[PDB]
Design a protein around this ligand. Structure first.
Ligand code: HEM
Ligand SMILES: Cc1cc(O)cc(C)c1C[C@@H]1NC(=O)[C@H](Cc2ccc(O)cc2)NC1=O
Length: 394
């Protein structure tokens, strides 16, 4: 006798378990047990993953309901699971979206200047360098302070909430509330601070005093700042870190992109496709009885959409483990999700990674791991897969 298959399968972000392809072939929707003890349906084919993500009857917001089967414990107030819906209901979606595009004047130059400064400092200090803690995460933090309009010197403290805020825990996390409440107070202070006139928080600060938004709550304005900083920084820092591993492990691709940087966008799109940064399937709660493949999912059941299931499905991406810069369907991966909840930061995340990689390959064309790959320490029970340190030489 064996227990019900447990998720997640592996916290390693440098390889997909052979188990994923066996599951997809034999049982592309199947029952699993999460870290809380709840049962859920794990969906691992491209066709069924897109079906779930394009049917709002599989609800994000309802995952927060009391009594629901849970993937993990909430680390935010339950109403914040519906953050984007709340922004939209408040009439703030176009303004938020506009503030977080990479198109703002000087943003790409800021990204390039910051990346080059971080890299020059690593070159001065000498090898080995830690490309997560001393490149990708500081580049993500600096980018999001600029996008939000808040001082660069406030980045580090907001960043240190994230090793707890994005935990994937069986139980509530006391520290998560301590840091959440503090970060909310910080963002409330920002809205009242007359120096803050640019970026997302500068715009929210103005809209808050506009009569057309007079009944939007102050809680929501502060919440948008905390959630967009946290989601953006953890997602871009973690994605760039694991993309750098995939690139370092492919010297032929590293050399090709170094020699022809015009291919970097197509490279980053493949690095997004094969990325293992999301540690768990995306959760949804059924609000009706719905057929998914051979399973009739019942109302109230938890469904987990395994992004690497979709993104390594050979029926959609032939030779899925290979980075191929000339695929016919290159952006059709699910790295940014799909449907109602498609990532609003997708363009910014692409540009963060493209500029970071462009800068690294110019400054460190001989970049290579400085330890055997198995020596990377993969963070556990977290919503992202990341190595604690990424030691490189060049
Ligand atoms: C490479 C970087 C990024 C990746 C891989 C990524 C990935 C994702 C994914 C897969 C989702 C869908 C979640 C779901 O459907 O359950 C999502 C949603 C979201 N992302 Fe991103 N993201 C990235 C960058 C960013 C950035 C830069 C921001 C903000 C600055 C951001 C903010 C959000 C928000 C607010 C949502 C929720 C949208 C909603 O519920 O409608 N992300 N992201
Ligand atoms: C768990 C968490 C902690 C935190 O301190 C801030 C946030 C935004 C989260 C949310 C968590 N992070 C994700 O990236 C995805 C996508 C998402 C992003 C933002 C959002 O507001 C709603 C959903 N899903 C999550 O549940």
């Amino acid at each position: 006798a064996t227990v019900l298959l447990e998720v997640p399968f592996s916290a390693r972000g440098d390889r997909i378990p052979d188990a994923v392809a066996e599951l997809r072939t034999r049982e592309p929707i199947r029952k699993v047990r999460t870290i809380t003890g709840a049962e859920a349906w794990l969906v691992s084919s491209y066709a069924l993953c897109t079906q779930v993500l394009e049917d709002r009857r599989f609800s994000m917001k309802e995952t927060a309901a009391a009594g629901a089967p849970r993937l993990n414990a909430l680390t935010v107030p339950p109403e914040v699971v519906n953050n984007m819906g709340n922004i939209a209901d408040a009439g703030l979606r176009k303004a938020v979206m506009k503030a977080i595009t990479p198109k703002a004047p000087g943003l790409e130059q800021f990204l390039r200047d910051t990346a080059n400064s971080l890299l020059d400092n690593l070159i001065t200090e000498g090898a080995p360098a830690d490309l997560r803690n001393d490149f990708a995460d500081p580049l993500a933090t600096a980018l999001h302070c600029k996008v939000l309009g808040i001082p660069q010197e406030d980045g580090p403290k907001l960043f240190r909430s994230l090793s707890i805020a994005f935990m994937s825990s069986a139980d509530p996390i006391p520290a998560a509330k301590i840091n959440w409440d503090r970060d909310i107070e910080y963002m409330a202070g920002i809205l009242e601070n007359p120096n803050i006139t640019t970026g997302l928080m500068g715009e929210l600060s103005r809209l808050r005093k506009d009569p057309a938004y007079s009944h939007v709550s102050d809680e929501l304005f502060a919440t948008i700042g905390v959630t967009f900083f946290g989601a953006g920084v953890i997602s871009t820092g973690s994605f760039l870190t694991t993309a750098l591993i995939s690139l370092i492990q492919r010297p032929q691709l590293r050399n090709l992109l170094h020699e022809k940087p015009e291919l970097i966008p197509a490279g980053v799109e493949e690095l997004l496709r094969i990325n293992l940064s999301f540690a768990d399937g995306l959760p949804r709660l059924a609000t009706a009885d719905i057929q998914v493949g051979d399973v009739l999912v019942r109302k109230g059941e938890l469904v987990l959409v395994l992004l690497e299931g979709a993104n390594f499905d050979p029926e959609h991406f032939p030779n899925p483990g290979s980075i191929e810069l000339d695929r016919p369907n290159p952006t059709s991966h699910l790295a940014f999700g799909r449907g109602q909840h498609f990532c609003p930061g997708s363009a910014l995340g692409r540009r963060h990674a493209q500029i970071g990689i462009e800068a690294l390959l110019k400054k460190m064309p001989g970049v290579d791991l400085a330890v055997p790959i198995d020596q990377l320490v993969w963070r556990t029970r977290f919503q992202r897969r990341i190595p604690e340190r990424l030691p490189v030489l060049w």
